[PDB]
Design an enzyme around this catalytic site. Structure first.
Site: not given
Ligand code: HEM
Ligand code: HEM
Lengths: 480, 480, 480, 480
Positions: B51, B124
């Protein structure tokens, strides 16, 4: 006051891990434990490469005599001005928690939080050094450091380096007196060792040496006194200096300055920029500047004493480094090692932060606690309210006196001459202390050629010292 | 404003190095130059191992409905309470400055600065995950990560892992719809993926799942659409979300919780603690909690968006992790990597610092900017005024349901059934998309056996999708 | 092969965490899990502060023409000598996984593993640079880097810097042709940009420039072509160059040297040592040296391409840096940043390790994999067989031509002259492409007087180009 | 042998910096100087959080008696099998270069480089610990560490913690005998302190304790003896052990094991898993395992003794940790701190590297010297030649015995009872020494309540000790 995690969540039970049953294994989900243990695991940082063992305190510096004749340094313009200082005194070779009763120069460091920036004074008690070029410093230190196999300091190793680097003779003369073991930090002097440059408001530059003189006097320990103390207290100097401040017997020193006009540098039998050389008070007078009083202990050792960094080339306007080749390497080394030891943003830590506001275009780096937030991170730029250069603050040009650059050793080394003068300037007590310490140390060398060379180096400095060492050792230098 | 070194010395000339002559070599004594360049040299820190690519902003969370029933969490007790938040949204696999048009789940992270400590929501967009045990995470990441020789992501590698780990089937259903490429960070949902435990004042605990719903609705990009955007803007989602806030078009999401009694966990054809499984809205209803509004861009990306750490295991009282085997490794992982990536004292930085005051016995560590000064650094101690534990905050006990510990896969895997359910829940539009994307991805697999396995796995899930994949690929599926 | 922990213990089960029950929480005693996760948590290191995005490969340098008349560099003495090389090519401004389609000069770095040490050539494709003093480099980078708030590059910022620093003009002429976007790494030239000094066996030194010519020709992308590429493949140049080597289409370049006597430095309308100035082929001719062939891809990107360090100041005997004020900062910068980025012992890594043996008195430092074991870690020492200096290798003296050191800008700036020359050497194609790219870039500037300044700077270089930019922009330039 | 830079370039002058003239300032381009100083600046790494003061040596362990009855550990199957070991002995509280004459437990660490991986024994000489849960370790260590303001250890601080954590009483009984100060590392015992689990080929597990008995005997120093040694030698134990090995008088220890069937744990007046509890030789017999001989000093302290990391939870197949709550936190902590102190790739260093080959899917991390190059970095995968799991090596399941998990203190604490027996097992000379040492220590406590608590804690263990302390102190305990 509620005990919390670093997340500010209140802790209910600070005594028991979370386990899979009363007598079952510990859970990975114990955030409180892992946060606590993980930080504990990370408490330590590297000790100083040298001078790891030390003691720091806060105080104030007070200017008594204006120095405007010699420097345009802001804090030194007017008598009566007071500047906050933080000081750190130290040994050299051995590590954190090493006894304070070992023979070593003693570090004498003072950070001045001035209206025009930080100035670091970073000296030793002893007025000279073993070497005169930074190129040799790792070697010298490696030789003096514990043997890399045994982890024990071995004179056979350092006397090797020193005899083969005979400019070290003068320093040897100082370090093996009883001044090699001060009785404490508060009972020792300070020395810039190097010349620096002070430039006044009109751009006249003089060479200067800096001198600290303790109000408590210089007091030393003999070898047997040092041993006696070591057995009872491996933290004696720290202990004594901490108690004195806590008891209100504030350690104080006077600051003096020696001034040598650049036009006079060829006038001696030594190069005044050679760090193996002293400027005798006899030849160049001390002029009183002011007095430092240390009146407040640290609140926290790690955050203050351990985390401070000093650099002799951290100077305020009115001050410049000399061409001194040992000093020149230090300019780089200190800040360079601090970026590793303390961190890239080490200058943002409370103990290192200037009193003067910091306004620039530097950004980011690990642990960016005092990140400047303006999006304008480049100069020149179009904005009138962002930081601009102040041309009157530019460091003036200095002279160059050679047509070549390269690896070029200075001409008048005078490795033995001044060392001899230093010997003959000593009282009989000092000369006898020096002989007994040298002998005790040379008795531990295991290579005859090194001993012979040591006695020869001392002989060249002073023939009678060399004869006494020869007799005590007993090594005849006559054939040579 | 005067331009200064990090030492607070005003800079005269920010444009010229100090050189040995006007056309001569640069001087090591140029402290200003060396400080500036050396800091520049240290600007960078490691990117997030996953990420890395992301966008952050500040905002507020407004609780609309009291959660007293389910949790004792302080901020959730009263309607109308407002908590400052900081959110970061992200892609997963590629690094910093990675195109935002790539197919990936999208991270959805929110730090709540609570009266009783920080709480990190770390989810997410997509409601499920590829695997169910942290043991497999480095393997899964390594398969999706650029090939370690070519430095380019290779379907041949990650299809290998995913086919050989059939539990991934459900996530593959979601990820290869067009929801694999959200149009923007503001046009996506959020999912906790795992269940967590909430515990009420009475001591009852429920399993919960968390849910973020975009006011701007969910919007996605077909492959070709993502290809168009990518050619003209590789920072498209960061750009859109930045501009939205700055234009006063504040992104909002409503938060919902799903509630499951621990007594009802074995009443499904799947394990509710299995991270590869969704809790369908029609089976467990969404209950409104409140709404997040993002109403301010960072002042500085590095010190805010880059330097923030989140951990799903960073929970306030009233919340506990479930025994979900994927979540459980995350409890360790996040804070462990932050200690490395950001530094031991990362919780001290402003972006990470709690609103609740921090008071504990932890000390030291690199860059100890917020060092607690009290010399009482141990507990228990004799001092009533130093931080003390508060027993009512002690995390409650939770049931154990087995007589052995060990490496023990869950019984009800159901690797294909819900994956099938999910497919037959799609519109015909979404099912065509899934097929196009799947085929275009499976066309890049150079090992025919991996392709066959993908096909079988989708087949076991839904026979019609299987045969369609087979027809298009084209590898009939009568043998094996 | 048995799968093992880092302790060499064979692993029974790489799929399941150890839990307190089949459906219970994970155990802190799962060493295997924690070792694996903790290492995954630490995979990442800081990316390069500039030139983060890049591609490396192994190959060979073959010398075709002896350079003995110009340098005593061992590897350059005999026609026929081969030296192993490692090369890395890069963009400049954006991070890892950034598009290779972006306007940027391209890095061209080559490590030569020579019989007498490593030599690093660290150039770009473009033959000049934006600035001429290292003092400006952080400012130049910061302006060009993403805006520290939006995380997107902004022409409004970098034009602000470039216009205010008009020495940049010549580089703008180059970077805004289509050469600002090479078609790939194999299809670009290389330049030393700076002059260096080569010193021969008789002790004569000449200024030199280095020049790489691609066997594949120079090929570029228009803005529209780069845009189409970008949509489809953000790793396009790495992809191309990797495949080329696997396919046996080995990227090759011829190396050429341009020579200048220190006596002829005043005979030009520019300062030869100004990094903003090219040495035109038709004024100083290219002399052929040899050819580099890249014939082997990396085994592993991280340990090779990521972990390599180059420094233009890493030179073999026969070579010395020039007084180029930009180059002189680079001498420091590269190694400095590598000690931070890669580690204190970065030179011990296989990719950085010399072919020649390393024998010295340096020791310790983090991760000391190749620690020298001899207890003799100091020099001078009494031991004949420990490493000794070899005086014939002493870098010889170089002239100094001034009688002051200080902050002193060079005389012949000629900020616009050669920039105009460059523009008039272009074809009609190139001048058209320049105009289009400039206009497109200058249309993104949001501040009036920056655009005006840009047009004036270009006008001063060439009146016609000045008028055309004025015409297209569209501000009349009749006043100023 | 030629002196070279880290670049492999021969040095010609290792004595002089390159300067702008013979007496002018140093040049930034002195690559040789800067590489040298800059590596010197980076020599240091963090010392161990505890046990920083230590001494390491190489040797061999020889198994005398098969242990197949109790463990399937490969090295312990056959009489006569020899395994290489590296041992490190240490003090606890103070830092590097701390005297070796201080009162402290003494660390006893042994790394076994086994055919099935590394096993670390990490014990102390004394057979019990101060605390029984990892949650308290930072606190305990903080209380014993130098006061964080004075940098001096203060009994007033550690007696505060200890009295308030009365489970410490048993350890106090041990540490305040003369066994608090061993005469050297070779004249002391070792103790696992914790029980561990040994599992045989059939999956039967027993609890074991480990015992080291020195051939040289246990020899201690009284306080006055320790004082006398301290004044003369602050490295005495390191000195003595290094010389013994160097002279061929190899330190030897016999390893013994004690075995307790898991079905007997409820049979004692103490919890056998409480680390404050000893297993007396007369209650559970010692069974001879083999002998360790230390026969080879290190070549280099830094790379060997300083850089080794041990972890008691680093075990070979046949071995598992006990549910001991103190041991449990240690499983995490050692490897956690080493990732920080040594580096993420610390297991790649020669001293830490297994004998058995390391084959797995972990990658990257700083200083990747031993990077595994296979591009298959994920598992499961399609290749039969890549590392695979070996299910026979799976750690066997163990029992759980509770129906809850949470923060749950063990029930039979018996804080004073066993402490009483330990006192009553002492000789009269041991008992006099204990009293002298405790009294000397408690006279330095400055808070009356702590002295009273200490005296009451000892009284509860043994009345006559309580009275003797009370009389000597002189503190009246009768009213309580
Ligand atoms: C003509 C001028 C310049 C050229 C041609 C150039 C070229 C390059 C190249 C090709 C790289 C990448 C090397 C690699 O592939 O590892 C690089 C990186 C870098 N450059 Fe330069 N550069 C120039 C000016 C400067 C200046 C003035 C500085 C500052 C003094 C600087 C500082 C750096 C730094 C700190 C890196 C990162 C290197 C690393 O992390 O190992 N550059 N530059
Ligand atoms: C009876 C219990 C314990 C014993 C016998 C013991 C013994 C030791 C020994 C001998 C060492 C030095 C290893 C070496 O020579 O490198 C050490 C270091 C260390 N210990 Fe323990 N200790 C105990 C308890 C603990 C606990 C409960 C913790 C916290 C979880 C802990 C944390 C540490 C740490 C962080 C180090 C530094 C290790 C390194 O940097 O490599 N110890 N201990």
């Amino acid at each position: 006051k509620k005990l919390t995690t670093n997340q500010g969540v209140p802790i209910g039970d600070n005594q028991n891990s979370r386990t899979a049953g009363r007598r079952g294994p510990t859970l990975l989900e114990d955030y409180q434990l892992i946060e606590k243990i993980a930080h504990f695991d990370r408490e330590r940082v590297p000790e100083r490469v040298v001078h790891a063992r030390g003691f720091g305190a806060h105080g104030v510096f007070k200017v008594k005599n204006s120095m405007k004749k010699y420097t345009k340094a802001a804090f030194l313009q007017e008598e009566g001005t007071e500047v906050p200082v933080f000081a750190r005194f130290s040994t050299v070779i051995h590590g954190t928690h090493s006894p304070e009763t070992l023979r070593d120069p003693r570090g004498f460091s003072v950070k001045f939080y001035t209206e025009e920036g930080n100035w670091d004074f970073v000296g030793n008690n002893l007025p000279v050094f073993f070497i005169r070029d930074a190129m040799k410093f790792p070697d010298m230190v490696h030789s003096l450091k514990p043997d890399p196999r045994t982890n024990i300091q071995d004179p056979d190793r350092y006397w090797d380096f020193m005899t083969l680097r005979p400019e070290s003779t003068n320093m040897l003369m100082h370090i093996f007196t009883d001044e090699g073991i001060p009785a404490s930090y508060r009972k020792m002097r300070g020395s810039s060792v190097h010349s620096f440059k002070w430039v006044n408001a009109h751009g006249n530059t003089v060479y200067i040496k800096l001198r600290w003189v303790p109000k408590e006097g210089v007091h030393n320990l003999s070898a047997d006194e040092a041993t006696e103390v070591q057995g009872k207290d491996f933290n004696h100097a720290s202990n004594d200096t901490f108690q004195a401040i806590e008891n209100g017997d504030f350690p104080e020193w006077d600051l003096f300055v020696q001034v040598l006009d650049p036009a006079d540098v060829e006038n001696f039998d030594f190069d005044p920029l050679d760090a193996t050389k002293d400027w005798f008070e006899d030849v160049i007078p001390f002029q009183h500047v002011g007095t430092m009083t240390l009146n407040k202990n640290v609140d926290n050792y790690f955050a203050e004493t351990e985390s401070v960094g000093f650099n002799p080339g951290v100077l305020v306007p009115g001050m410049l480094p000399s061409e001194d080749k040992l000093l020149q390497g230090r300019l780089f080394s200190y800040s360079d090692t601090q970026r590793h030891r303390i961190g890239p943003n080490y200058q943002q830590l409370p103990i290192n932060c200037p009193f003067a506001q910091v306004n620039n275009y530097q950004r980011d780096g690990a642990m960016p606690f005092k990140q400047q937030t303006s999006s304008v991170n480049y100069e020149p730029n179009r904005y009138q309210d962002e930081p601009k250069q102040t041309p009157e603050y530019t460091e003036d040009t200095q002279p160059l006196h050679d047509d070549i650059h390269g690896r070029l050793e200075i001409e008048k080394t005078n490795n033995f001459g001044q060392a001899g003068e230093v010997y003959r300037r000593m009282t009989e007590e000092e000369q006898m202390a020096l002989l007994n310490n040298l002998v005790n140390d040379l008795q531990q060398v295991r290579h005859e050629n090194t001993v012979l060379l040591a006695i020869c180096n001392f002989y060249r400095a002073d023939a009678s010292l060399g004869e006494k060492l020869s007799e005590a050792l007993n090594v005849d230098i006559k054939p040579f």
